[PDB]
Amino acid sequence: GAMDMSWTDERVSTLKKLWLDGLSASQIAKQLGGVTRNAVIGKVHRLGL
């Protein structure tokens, strides 16, 4: 099966807060777990942040 984590409401809320807080995509990926820096960047892009 695929190992990609779903962008649950909680994971999105966490990403959004941390991004607005000024954390790097690397740091956010580390805190979310199971997702890469580049995948975080892509999600930030899709969220319009």
Polymer length in residues for the chain: 49
Going from N- to C-terminal start, the domains of the chain cover: 1-49
For 7-12, the CB contacts below 8 A with 24+ separation are 7/43, 12/43, 12/47
- What is the Cα–Cα distance from 49 to 47, expressed in whole angstroms? 6
Which approach determined this entry?
A: X-ray
Resolution (A): 1.4
Find the radius of gyration of the CA atoms of the chain.
Answer: 10
